[PDB]
Amino acid sequence: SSDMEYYYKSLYPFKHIFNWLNHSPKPSRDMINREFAMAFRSGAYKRYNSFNSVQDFKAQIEKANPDRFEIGAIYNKPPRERDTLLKSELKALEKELVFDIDMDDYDAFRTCCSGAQVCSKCWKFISLAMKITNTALREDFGYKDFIWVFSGRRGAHCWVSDKRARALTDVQRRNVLDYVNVIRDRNTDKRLALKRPYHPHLARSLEQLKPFFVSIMLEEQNPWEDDQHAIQTLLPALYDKQLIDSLKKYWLDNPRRSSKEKWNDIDQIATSLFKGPKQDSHIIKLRECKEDLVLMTLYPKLDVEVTKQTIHLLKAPFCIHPATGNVCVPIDESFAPEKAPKLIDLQTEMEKNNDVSLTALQPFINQFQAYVSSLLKNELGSVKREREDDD
Amino acid sequence: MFRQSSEEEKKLYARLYESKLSFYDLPPQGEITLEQFEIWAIDRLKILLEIESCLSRNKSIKEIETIIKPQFQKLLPFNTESLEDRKKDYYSHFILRLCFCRSKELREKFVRAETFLFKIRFNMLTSTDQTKFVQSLDLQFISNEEKAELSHQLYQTVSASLQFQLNLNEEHQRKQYFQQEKFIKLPFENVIELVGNRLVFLKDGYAYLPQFQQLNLLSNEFASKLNQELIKTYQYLPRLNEDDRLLPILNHLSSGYT
């Protein structure tokens, strides 16, 4: 508890977070009416907090001293005044569009680690997921005011703060989520449901993921070296029963062939089976199955519960993870979890230097400050364009 | 070469039904009877009750059309020149505004049923009538250069839809149709239901929509404007309370939905 008190009093960037959530140096409804929730070591959890200013925000989080606090929607009236309101009178107006990716969703194909454990070998899943998502957010939706945040142990959170993104309704959020959710079923015993020819989003994502399929899936992770795992995850994605039976029989006679070897066996056995006039069609179908496998293995996997409602609460940036001790820092695609700071290490560094700018947390604070500066500039430009359009 | 050279209410309803459908845009005038008020409201209410019943039974558009179309000739005629039918349709809609503006649940049910009836009747139109009706509502197409630059992405987006929705199984036919097809550009938030199904192409925050689609925008505008008009209708219900002879009828009409 004392370490958390020291963290909020010495290290947490309240000013930058206030500028991000308020969208203004001076106070506004975007902070006054924003819900915050606090989680405590006693097991208690308190909703519907909101803060009048950066000083009030900092003072209340310091005074409460939670393990973590979570960010919710902007409301029509202050959530801290809910005792003056009926439950139907307090209503949401905006929240940042948030996406959540977890490493545990890739355990169908990850091998080097499993569960909430992580390493730089498997974080390439998250890096590619971030890359595909960023391409979608910029090229498809036109967003610019977004930032990625490490969950502290096993995932990454993207906080989109563009004004049009903040204003999305629950129905609109669910449909945006559906647009970016491609692998809508996680079970491995079927080929993907995607229609052909590909929508341009799918085609571009596939072309972005193709150069990394060999190195990550077939060589680094190599999940299909186990024959039973290949029979349970690789073969059901193929289009033909005779091909599946031939591969199963061949691998049971010739066990423990690597994922790369099995990937080549698919082509070789298909070429041996599908001779004659229909050979081009069978080759096309086989290629479709392999393309769908690339998407099935490397495309972003998302927690729908974080995105599908405006009122949802999620662990704020620069929080401390209770088990690992890591800071929930901002990140980019080149990140790995081994690069995250820890509370004990930051306390040690502050004891040695007595200056946050000389700790390992300052590069992440620099990233967040640059993001906030860009966000505020774009907000002011949007207000100027709206005023000129109104004039 | 050779060359040569109240009534207002009737003209109003002729104008309102020249398009064969209406957004129900304008205040009625003149008089009808109280028996007509009750019966016309009940007729439209019966059609909307069956629409909501079929939707609660999860029946498709084709099934609902098969169920509802025989009922127009008996309860609420459509594609008709008769002034009586046109007044019956218009007035019955306006009556059920006053019945169903009363609460959020009633407003939602009435908007849903009436918008689905709007969809049904729009499907009954010829393409010329649809075009004229859309043009009458004062409802941006992309340039040929922009279509050419985005042609690969747009064709990849619509090629499956051309095969399944317009039955164009031949790729040659799809290419010819695509060469003749127009596209609309608007913000992606306006067509988000098509976005979630990946039926439209997205670029820089704008959705690219082919002309053979987009009826959901028309019906959503109908639903939104009807919801706003119902909210307005709710705000001036205290003026309805000046004639007692109408309140039992409206209570009876709303009781079948509660």
From Swiss-Prot, chain A:
The gene is PRI1. DNA primase is the polymerase that synthesizes small RNA primers for the Okazaki fragments made during discontinuous DNA replication. In a complex with DNA polymerase alpha (DNA polymerase alpha:primase) constitutes a replicative polymerase. Both primase components participate in formation of the active center, but the ATP-binding site is exclusively located on p48. The bound zinc ion is not a cofactor. It is bound to a zinc knuckle motif that may be involved in sequence recognition and the binding of ssDNA. Present with 197 molecules/cell in log phase SD medium. GO terms for molecular function: ATP binding; DNA-directed RNA polymerase activity; metal ion binding. One of its GO terms (biological process) is DNA replication, synthesis of primer. This is DNA primase small subunit. The active site is at E35, D100, D102. Keywords: ATP-binding, DNA replication, DNA-directed RNA polymerase, Metal-binding, Nucleotide-binding, Nucleotidyltransferase, Primosome, Transcription, Transferase, Zinc. It holds the Pfam family DNA_primase_S. CDD domains: AE_Prim_S. Belongs to the eukaryotic-type primase small subunit family. Its EC number is 2.7.7.-. InterPro entries: DNA_primase_S, DNA_primase_ssu_euk/arc.
Swiss-Prot record, chain B:
Residues 169-198 are annotated as: H-T-H-like motif. It comes from the Eukaryota. Disulfide bonds: none annotated. Belongs to the eukaryotic-type primase large subunit family. DNA polymerase alpha:primase is a four subunit enzyme complex, which is assembled throughout the cell cycle, and consists of the two DNA polymerase subunits A POL1 and B POL12, and the DNA primase large PRI2 and small PRI1 subunits. Interacts with MCM10. DNA primase is the polymerase that synthesizes small RNA primers for the Okazaki fragments made during discontinuous DNA replication. In a complex with DNA polymerase alpha (DNA polymerase alpha:primase) constitutes a replicative polymerase. Both primase components participate in formation of the active center, but the ATP-binding site is exclusively located on p48. This is DNA primase large subunit. It comes from Saccharomyces cerevisiae (strain ATCC 204508 / S288c) (Baker's yeast). The chain holds residues 1 to 299 of 528 of the full protein.
